[PDB]
Amino acid sequence: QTPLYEQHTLCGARMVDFHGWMMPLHYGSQIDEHHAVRTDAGMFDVSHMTIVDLRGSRTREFLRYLLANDVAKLTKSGKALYSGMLNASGGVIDDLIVYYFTEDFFRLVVNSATREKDLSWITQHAEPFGIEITVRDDLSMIAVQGPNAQAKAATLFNDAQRQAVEGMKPFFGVQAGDLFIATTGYTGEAGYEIALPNEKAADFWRALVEAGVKPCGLGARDTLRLEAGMNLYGQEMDETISPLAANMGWTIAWEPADRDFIGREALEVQREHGTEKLVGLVMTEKGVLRNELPVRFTDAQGNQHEGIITSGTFSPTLGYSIALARVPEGIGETAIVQIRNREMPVKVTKPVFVRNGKAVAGLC
Known part of the structure; x- marks a missing residue:
């Protein structure tokens, strides 16, 4: 409470x-x-969020191994970054914000839903680095x-x-x-x-x-x-989904190549092979896009594809329905969803809709 x-x-x-x-x-x-x-x-x-304080001379070292973004990039005291925390298969355990204060003191913030899983995982991997974890x-x-x-x-x-x-x-x-x-x-x-x-x-x-x-x-x-366009763990990703398929590619610090982190080699293979991608959908037609609705299209080669809405809603700012969706590569400008037992074309867009009180450029 x-x-x-x-x-x-x-x-x-x-x-x-x-x-x-x-x-x-x-x-x-x-x-x-x-x-x-x-x-x-x-x-x-x-x-309902959990703030986790991390203390110890090896804290930065620990986090460079734990997280897929690179906390080496936090060089000014107080600086934060957004990162995935991955399993060895390259799926997402959680996303989080991490702060650098001193070389002996960083801070993570995580959600209630994933608190105990995250704490267990962080504790396990912290031990060889000698990191003191304080919730x-x-x-x-x-x-x-x-x-x-x-x-x-x-x-x-x-x-x-x-x-x-x-x-x-x-x-x-x-x-x-x-x-x-x-x-x-x-x-x-x-x-x-x-x-x-x-x-x-x-x-x-x-x-x-x-x-x-x-x-x-x-x-x-x-x-x-x-x-x-901000992710919600459990919807835009989970332990079975690569960050590359959840619009989190931008958070992966591939260089320097010699930085080992959990999920690294699985992620490299995923990048080589290609993954699904998180896109935006806009439906100006009356109705509301729902979580888990299928999204269908045919690629240029004639392969029929089915993705899925990860999060849908009616946008109060825009006045029509929007969604994030995970879809196979090869999607065009439109796709089809089922609305009132019928096909409904939707517009495929970037996975972001409103920033700083205004519709993003593609929507105005």
Whole structure:
């Protein structure tokens, strides 16, 4: 149970189960919550996330072996990156954000659904490197997102905290007293994620409401992230799916070739052979694209292919249905899905739809 539970109820939360946590689906209007993030500021309780602190002189070394992105690229203190964590078959165990603070101190953030699997795996592979693993269940976290999010949050910062984040670029995190403030998010907008002691969380939440930040629930969390082309573990990938087939190729640090990491050789073979690809689908016709719907097309050579929707939704920003889908190579400009017992052509696009309050160029 989140430390924010009482504040959620006071904010009119309609609760659902989220991987064992009672969490707000919305607070009266998931559509308004979505539009708040796109145009002003909304916030999400992400205390269901697990923050894992890693300590030890070999921490960077460990993570260069654990992760498929390369934390050697984190050279400025506080810098973060996004990475897959792969099994030996090159499938995805999870995705995550990792922060570098010092050579003796990095931090990972992972989801509730995969927490115990990840912890077991991290623990197992950490042992020979002598890494001390500390789970930060003493911290809650709030994501404040939207074009006015940083400004509104910053009204609550003290002078030292303002100074710490002044000019801070994306994908950095910094500790300033009780607040860990990071320029991260799951929305396609600017914002912060802010971690702080459980016992401080409720008051900080209330202060943020007063600062003009709208409480936003899981429903908007999902429409926002899918519009932004951001993956959801279990849907866009899982242990059976290569990152190359989940639009995560860009996160694979192939060079330097001499960096060993788990999944490396399987991944190299997958790259050599080719994989399926994650694309976007747009359906302007009335109806909603659903998870697991088949996607059919014929390639130029006449081979009939079937992919699958990984995540679908009705886009509040665009006003029509969108989806991420995993499809065989060779797809064209359109494909077919079944809607109301009939074939429905859909437009095939890049796996991203909205960033910074606006439809991406291919959609306007």
